[PDB]
Amino acid sequence: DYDELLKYYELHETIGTGGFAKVKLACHILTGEMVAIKIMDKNTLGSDLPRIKTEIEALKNLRHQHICQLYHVLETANKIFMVLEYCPGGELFDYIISQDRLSEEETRVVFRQIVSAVAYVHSQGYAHRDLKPENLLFDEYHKLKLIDFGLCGSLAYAAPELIQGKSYLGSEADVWSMGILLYVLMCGFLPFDDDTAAALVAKIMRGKYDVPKWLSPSSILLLQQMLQVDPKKRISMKNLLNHPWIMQDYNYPVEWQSKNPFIHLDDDCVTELSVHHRNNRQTMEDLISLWQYDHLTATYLLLLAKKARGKPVRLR
Numbered sequence: 001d002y003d004e005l006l007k008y009y010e011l012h013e014t015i016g017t018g019g020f021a022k023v024k025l026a027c028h029i030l031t032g033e034m035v036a037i038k039i040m041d042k043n044t045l046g047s048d049l050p051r052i053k054t055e056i057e058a059l060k061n062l063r064h065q066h067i068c069q070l071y072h073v074l075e076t077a078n079k080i081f082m083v084l085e086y087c088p089g090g091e092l093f094d095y096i097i098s099q100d101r102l103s104e105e106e107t108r109v110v111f112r113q114i115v116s117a118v119a120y121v122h123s124q125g126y127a128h129r130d131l132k133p134e135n136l137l138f139d140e141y142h143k144l145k146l147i148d149f150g151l152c153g154s155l156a157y158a159a160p161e162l163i164q165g166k167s168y169l170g171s172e173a174d175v176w177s178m179g180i181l182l183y184v185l186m187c188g189f190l191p192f193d194d195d196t197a198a199a200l201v202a203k204i205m206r207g208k209y210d211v212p213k214w215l216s217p218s219s220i221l222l223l224q225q226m227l228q229v230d231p232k233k234r235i236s237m238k239n240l241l242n243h244p245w246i247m248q249d250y251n252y253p254v255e256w257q258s259k260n261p262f263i264h265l266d267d268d269c270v271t272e273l274s275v276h277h278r279n280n281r282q283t284m285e286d287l288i289s290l291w292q293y294d295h296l297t298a299t300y301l302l303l304l305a306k307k308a309r310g311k312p313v314r315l316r
Protein backbone atom coordinates (compact mmCIF):
# COMPACT_ATOMS: atom_id res chain seq x y z
CA ASP A 1 0.00 0.00 0.00
CA TYR A 2 0.81 3.65 -0.81
CA ASP A 3 -1.08 5.57 1.88
CA GLU A 4 1.90 6.39 4.10
CA LEU A 5 4.37 6.94 1.19
CA LEU A 6 2.19 9.56 -0.51
CA LYS A 7 1.97 11.52 2.73
CA TYR A 8 5.72 12.10 2.36
CA TYR A 9 6.44 11.82 -1.40
CA GLU A 10 4.91 13.01 -4.66
CA LEU A 11 5.43 10.36 -7.35
CA HIS A 12 6.75 11.32 -10.79
CA GLU A 13 7.69 9.13 -13.81
CA THR A 14 8.98 5.55 -13.72
CA ILE A 15 12.70 5.43 -14.45
CA GLY A 16 13.34 1.73 -13.71
CA THR A 17 11.70 -1.21 -15.48
CA GLY A 18 12.27 -4.61 -13.76
CA GLY A 19 10.97 -8.12 -12.99
CA PHE A 20 10.71 -8.14 -9.18
CA ALA A 21 10.81 -4.32 -8.79
CA LYS A 22 9.89 -0.87 -10.21
CA VAL A 23 11.67 2.46 -9.60
CA LYS A 24 10.01 5.89 -9.50
CA LEU A 25 11.35 9.40 -9.56
CA ALA A 26 9.77 11.26 -6.62
CA CYS A 27 9.85 14.53 -4.70
CA HIS A 28 10.34 14.55 -0.92
CA ILE A 29 7.58 17.03 0.03
CA LEU A 30 9.13 18.63 3.13
CA THR A 31 12.51 19.48 1.56
CA GLY A 32 11.54 19.64 -2.14
CA GLU A 33 14.44 17.30 -2.93
CA MET A 34 14.22 14.67 -5.68
CA VAL A 35 14.74 10.99 -4.79
CA ALA A 36 14.45 7.57 -6.51
CA ILE A 37 12.04 5.14 -4.86
CA LYS A 38 12.61 1.43 -5.40
CA ILE A 39 9.37 -0.53 -4.95
CA MET A 40 9.68 -4.23 -4.05
CA ASP A 41 6.76 -6.66 -3.61
CA LYS A 42 6.98 -9.06 -0.65
CA ASN A 43 4.94 -11.90 -2.22
CA THR A 44 7.17 -11.74 -5.27
CA LEU A 45 10.27 -11.76 -3.04
CA GLY A 46 8.94 -14.78 -1.08
CA SER A 47 11.54 -16.56 1.07
CA ASP A 48 14.25 -14.15 -0.15
CA LEU A 49 12.56 -11.42 1.91
CA PRO A 50 14.81 -12.09 4.96
CA ARG A 51 17.94 -11.90 2.77
CA ILE A 52 16.74 -8.59 1.23
CA LYS A 53 16.20 -7.21 4.75
CA THR A 54 19.77 -8.23 5.75
CA GLU A 55 21.13 -6.34 2.69
CA ILE A 56 19.02 -3.21 3.44
CA GLU A 57 20.46 -3.39 6.96
CA ALA A 58 24.00 -3.43 5.42
CA LEU A 59 23.22 -0.44 3.18
CA LYS A 60 22.22 1.52 6.31
CA ASN A 61 25.83 1.12 7.44
CA LEU A 62 27.36 2.49 4.24
CA ARG A 63 28.07 6.18 3.76
CA HIS A 64 30.29 7.02 0.81
CA GLN A 65 30.67 9.31 -2.17
CA HIS A 66 30.53 6.37 -4.65
CA ILE A 67 27.72 4.48 -2.96
CA CYS A 68 24.07 5.26 -3.51
CA GLN A 69 22.70 6.83 -0.32
CA LEU A 70 19.70 5.29 1.43
CA TYR A 71 17.24 7.84 2.93
CA HIS A 72 14.10 5.96 4.03
CA VAL A 73 12.81 2.38 4.26
CA LEU A 74 9.07 1.99 4.52
CA GLU A 75 7.43 -1.42 4.90
CA THR A 76 3.74 -2.14 4.51
CA ALA A 77 1.50 -5.21 4.16
CA ASN A 78 2.78 -6.07 0.67
CA LYS A 79 5.64 -3.69 -0.16
CA ILE A 80 9.04 -2.49 0.88
CA PHE A 81 9.93 0.98 -0.39
CA MET A 82 13.55 2.07 -0.50
CA VAL A 83 14.07 5.81 -0.88
CA LEU A 84 17.44 6.44 -2.44
CA GLU A 85 19.70 9.08 -3.94
CA TYR A 86 18.55 9.85 -7.47
CA CYS A 87 21.29 9.13 -10.03
CA PRO A 88 20.20 10.82 -13.31
CA GLY A 89 23.04 9.58 -15.61
CA GLY A 90 21.71 5.99 -15.84
CA GLU A 91 23.50 2.64 -15.81
CA LEU A 92 27.17 2.19 -16.68
CA PHE A 93 25.83 -0.66 -18.86
CA ASP A 94 24.03 1.73 -21.19
CA TYR A 95 27.00 4.11 -21.19
CA ILE A 96 29.39 1.35 -22.36
CA ILE A 97 26.99 0.22 -25.10
CA SER A 98 26.44 3.84 -26.29
CA GLN A 99 30.23 4.47 -26.59
CA ASP A 100 31.23 0.95 -27.86
CA ARG A 101 34.25 0.92 -25.51
CA LEU A 102 35.98 3.49 -23.33
CA SER A 103 39.46 4.90 -23.88
CA GLU A 104 42.09 3.62 -21.48
CA GLU A 105 42.23 6.96 -19.71
CA GLU A 106 38.41 7.14 -19.25
CA THR A 107 38.27 3.53 -18.07
CA ARG A 108 40.98 4.36 -15.49
CA VAL A 109 38.96 7.35 -14.11
CA VAL A 110 35.81 5.21 -13.82
CA PHE A 111 37.58 2.09 -12.52
CA ARG A 112 39.21 4.06 -9.71
CA GLN A 113 35.72 5.09 -8.48
CA ILE A 114 34.57 1.41 -8.55
CA VAL A 115 37.65 0.40 -6.54
CA SER A 116 36.99 3.29 -4.11
CA ALA A 117 33.42 2.12 -3.40
CA VAL A 118 34.27 -1.59 -3.18
CA ALA A 119 37.30 -1.07 -0.93
CA TYR A 120 35.05 0.93 1.42
CA VAL A 121 32.37 -1.80 1.41
CA HIS A 122 35.05 -4.34 2.43
CA SER A 123 36.43 -2.02 5.14
CA GLN A 124 32.99 -2.00 6.77
CA GLY A 125 32.98 -5.83 6.92
CA TYR A 126 30.82 -6.58 3.83
CA ALA A 127 31.21 -7.70 0.22
CA HIS A 128 29.01 -6.81 -2.78
CA ARG A 129 29.02 -10.19 -4.59
CA ASP A 130 27.09 -8.97 -7.67
CA LEU A 131 29.33 -6.36 -9.25
CA LYS A 132 28.43 -5.70 -12.89
CA PRO A 133 27.58 -2.64 -15.02
CA GLU A 134 23.85 -2.78 -14.19
CA ASN A 135 24.74 -2.19 -10.51
CA LEU A 136 26.71 1.02 -11.19
CA LEU A 137 24.88 4.29 -11.93
CA PHE A 138 26.17 7.73 -12.92
CA ASP A 139 25.06 10.86 -11.06
CA GLU A 140 24.66 14.28 -12.77
CA TYR A 141 28.46 14.85 -12.47
CA HIS A 142 29.07 11.49 -14.17
CA LYS A 143 30.51 10.05 -10.96
CA LEU A 144 29.68 6.39 -10.21
CA LYS A 145 27.25 5.32 -7.51
CA LEU A 146 27.24 1.63 -6.47
CA ILE A 147 23.81 0.05 -6.12
CA ASP A 148 22.44 -3.50 -5.87
CA PHE A 149 19.28 -5.42 -6.99
CA GLY A 150 19.71 -4.20 -10.61
CA LEU A 151 18.73 -6.75 -13.29
CA CYS A 152 22.79 -15.76 -18.10
CA GLY A 153 22.79 -12.35 -16.39
CA SER A 154 25.42 -11.94 -13.68
CA LEU A 155 26.78 -15.49 -14.23
CA ALA A 156 29.25 -13.84 -16.65
CA TYR A 157 30.61 -11.77 -13.72
CA ALA A 158 30.69 -14.56 -11.10
CA ALA A 159 34.05 -15.87 -9.80
CA PRO A 160 34.75 -19.61 -10.43
CA GLU A 161 34.70 -20.54 -6.70
CA LEU A 162 31.40 -18.69 -6.42
CA ILE A 163 30.05 -20.52 -9.51
CA GLN A 164 30.67 -23.95 -8.01
CA GLY A 165 29.03 -23.28 -4.63
CA LYS A 166 32.26 -23.85 -2.73
CA SER A 167 33.80 -21.78 0.06
CA TYR A 168 34.94 -18.33 -0.89
CA LEU A 169 35.81 -14.89 0.44
CA GLY A 170 33.39 -12.16 -0.63
CA SER A 171 36.30 -9.73 -1.14
CA GLU A 172 38.04 -12.16 -3.52
CA ALA A 173 34.81 -12.69 -5.49
CA ASP A 174 34.48 -8.89 -5.81
CA VAL A 175 38.05 -8.60 -7.22
CA TRP A 176 37.26 -11.18 -9.91
CA SER A 177 34.08 -9.34 -10.88
CA MET A 178 35.99 -6.06 -11.00
CA GLY A 179 38.37 -7.81 -13.45
CA ILE A 180 35.44 -8.72 -15.74
CA LEU A 181 34.21 -5.09 -15.42
CA LEU A 182 37.71 -3.80 -16.38
CA TYR A 183 37.74 -5.97 -19.50
CA VAL A 184 34.24 -4.85 -20.60
CA LEU A 185 35.05 -1.17 -19.98
CA MET A 186 38.06 -1.42 -22.30
CA CYS A 187 36.67 -3.93 -24.83
CA GLY A 188 32.88 -3.44 -24.92
CA PHE A 189 32.22 -7.20 -24.74
CA LEU A 190 32.73 -9.92 -22.08
CA PRO A 191 35.93 -12.01 -21.68
CA PHE A 192 33.89 -15.20 -21.17
CA ASP A 193 30.69 -15.39 -23.21
CA ASP A 194 28.43 -18.06 -24.68
CA ASP A 195 24.87 -19.04 -25.67
CA THR A 196 24.32 -21.48 -22.79
CA ALA A 197 25.05 -21.61 -19.05
CA ALA A 198 27.08 -24.85 -19.19
CA ALA A 199 29.41 -23.51 -21.90
CA LEU A 200 29.83 -20.12 -20.22
CA VAL A 201 30.75 -21.70 -17.18
CA ALA A 202 33.26 -24.17 -18.56
CA LYS A 203 34.90 -21.06 -20.10
CA ILE A 204 35.01 -19.24 -16.71
CA MET A 205 36.57 -22.31 -15.03
CA ARG A 206 39.27 -22.59 -17.73
CA GLY A 207 40.08 -18.88 -17.33
CA LYS A 208 41.22 -18.40 -20.96
CA TYR A 209 40.13 -15.33 -22.95
CA ASP A 210 41.09 -13.32 -26.04
CA VAL A 211 43.22 -10.20 -25.70
CA PRO A 212 42.13 -7.61 -28.30
CA LYS A 213 45.01 -5.81 -30.04
CA TRP A 214 44.10 -2.35 -28.67
CA LEU A 215 44.79 -3.34 -25.02
CA SER A 216 48.00 -1.81 -23.62
CA PRO A 217 50.67 -4.13 -22.17
CA SER A 218 49.98 -2.72 -18.66
CA SER A 219 46.21 -3.31 -19.02
CA ILE A 220 46.92 -6.91 -20.00
CA LEU A 221 49.07 -7.46 -16.86
CA LEU A 222 46.40 -6.04 -14.56
CA LEU A 223 43.64 -8.17 -16.16
CA GLN A 224 45.68 -11.34 -15.60
CA GLN A 225 46.21 -10.36 -11.94
CA MET A 226 42.47 -9.85 -11.35
CA LEU A 227 41.25 -12.85 -13.40
CA GLN A 228 43.12 -15.63 -11.66
CA VAL A 229 40.89 -18.68 -11.33
CA ASP A 230 42.63 -19.57 -8.03
CA PRO A 231 41.42 -16.94 -5.51
CA LYS A 232 44.69 -17.22 -3.54
CA LYS A 233 46.61 -15.90 -6.63
CA ARG A 234 44.19 -13.03 -7.29
CA ILE A 235 45.41 -9.53 -6.54
CA SER A 236 44.34 -8.18 -3.13
CA MET A 237 42.44 -4.94 -2.64
CA LYS A 238 45.53 -3.63 -0.82
CA ASN A 239 47.66 -4.06 -3.97
CA LEU A 240 44.94 -2.78 -6.28
CA LEU A 241 44.65 0.59 -4.47
CA ASN A 242 48.19 1.60 -5.47
CA HIS A 243 48.69 -0.57 -8.58
CA PRO A 244 50.96 0.95 -11.32
CA TRP A 245 48.15 0.83 -13.90
CA ILE A 246 45.73 2.45 -11.42
CA MET A 247 48.23 5.30 -10.88
CA GLN A 248 49.41 5.59 -14.48
CA ASP A 249 47.59 8.90 -15.25
CA TYR A 250 46.94 10.26 -11.75
CA ASN A 251 49.90 9.35 -9.57
CA TYR A 252 48.12 8.86 -6.21
CA PRO A 253 46.55 5.75 -4.61
CA VAL A 254 42.74 5.38 -4.83
CA GLU A 255 40.95 7.55 -2.25
CA TRP A 256 38.69 4.82 -0.85
CA GLN A 257 37.89 6.38 2.55
CA SER A 258 34.52 8.04 3.01
CA LYS A 259 34.69 11.80 2.34
CA ASN A 260 31.37 12.42 4.07
CA PRO A 261 31.18 10.13 7.14
CA PHE A 262 28.55 10.65 9.87
CA ILE A 263 30.49 12.06 12.84
CA HIS A 264 28.20 14.23 14.93
CA LEU A 265 24.81 15.55 13.93
CA ASP A 266 24.95 18.71 11.84
CA ASP A 267 23.78 21.56 14.07
CA ASP A 268 22.06 23.56 11.31
CA CYS A 269 19.95 20.55 10.24
CA VAL A 270 19.04 19.78 13.90
CA THR A 271 18.03 23.43 14.35
CA GLU A 272 15.63 23.36 11.36
CA LEU A 273 14.10 20.03 12.44
CA SER A 274 13.60 21.34 16.02
CA VAL A 275 11.70 24.45 14.83
CA HIS A 276 9.64 22.33 12.43
CA HIS A 277 8.74 19.54 14.89
CA ARG A 278 8.29 21.99 17.78
CA ASN A 279 10.93 20.12 19.82
CA ASN A 280 13.96 21.35 21.77
CA ARG A 281 17.47 20.46 20.49
CA GLN A 282 18.22 17.61 22.90
CA THR A 283 14.95 15.74 22.24
CA MET A 284 15.38 16.26 18.45
CA GLU A 285 18.97 14.95 18.54
CA ASP A 286 17.82 11.98 20.59
CA LEU A 287 15.13 11.15 17.97
CA ILE A 288 17.51 11.52 15.02
CA SER A 289 20.17 9.37 16.77
CA LEU A 290 17.88 6.36 16.73
CA TRP A 291 18.60 6.23 12.95
CA GLN A 292 15.38 4.32 12.15
CA TYR A 293 15.47 5.17 8.38
CA ASP A 294 11.94 6.48 8.83
CA HIS A 295 10.73 9.90 7.52
CA LEU A 296 12.82 11.75 10.13
CA THR A 297 16.04 10.08 8.95
CA ALA A 298 15.08 10.96 5.36
CA THR A 299 14.43 14.61 6.20
CA TYR A 300 17.66 14.90 8.20
CA LEU A 301 19.74 13.39 5.36
CA LEU A 302 18.06 15.46 2.68
CA LEU A 303 18.65 18.71 4.69
CA LEU A 304 22.30 17.65 4.97
CA ALA A 305 22.45 17.25 1.15
CA LYS A 306 20.88 20.75 0.81
CA LYS A 307 23.60 22.22 3.01
CA ALA A 308 26.31 20.49 0.98
CA ARG A 309 24.92 22.20 -2.16
CA GLY A 310 24.99 25.64 -0.50
CA LYS A 311 21.19 25.85 -0.32
CA PRO A 312 19.24 27.30 2.59
CA VAL A 313 18.79 24.58 5.23
CA ARG A 314 15.01 25.01 5.30
CA LEU A 315 11.82 22.91 5.27
CA ARG A 316 8.86 23.97 3.07
Ligand SMILES: COc1cc(OCC#Cc2ccc3ccncc3c2)ccc1C[NH+]1CC[NH2+]CC1
Pocket residue numbers: 015016023036038055056058059062067068082084085086087088126127128129137146147148149
Ligand atom coordinates in the same frame (compact mmCIF):
# COMPACT_ATOMS: atom_id res chain seq x y z
C1 LIG B 1 25.70 -0.61 -2.22
O1 LIG B 1 24.91 -1.50 -1.42
C2 LIG B 1 23.57 -1.63 -1.71
C3 LIG B 1 22.90 -0.92 -2.70
C4 LIG B 1 21.54 -1.12 -2.92
O2 LIG B 1 20.93 -0.40 -3.92
C5 LIG B 1 19.48 -0.48 -4.12
C6 LIG B 1 19.16 0.43 -5.24
C7 LIG B 1 18.91 1.16 -6.15
C8 LIG B 1 18.60 2.04 -7.25
C9 LIG B 1 18.02 1.55 -8.41
C10 LIG B 1 17.73 2.41 -9.46
C11 LIG B 1 18.01 3.78 -9.36
C12 LIG B 1 17.74 4.69 -10.39
C13 LIG B 1 18.05 6.01 -10.22
N1 LIG B 1 18.61 6.50 -9.11
C14 LIG B 1 18.88 5.65 -8.12
C15 LIG B 1 18.60 4.28 -8.19
C16 LIG B 1 18.89 3.40 -7.14
C17 LIG B 1 20.85 -2.04 -2.15
C18 LIG B 1 21.51 -2.75 -1.16
C19 LIG B 1 22.87 -2.56 -0.92
C20 LIG B 1 23.57 -3.35 0.17
N2 LIG B 1 24.69 -4.25 -0.27
C21 LIG B 1 24.17 -5.39 -1.09
C22 LIG B 1 25.33 -6.28 -1.53
N3 LIG B 1 26.04 -6.82 -0.34
C23 LIG B 1 26.56 -5.72 0.51
C24 LIG B 1 25.44 -4.77 0.92
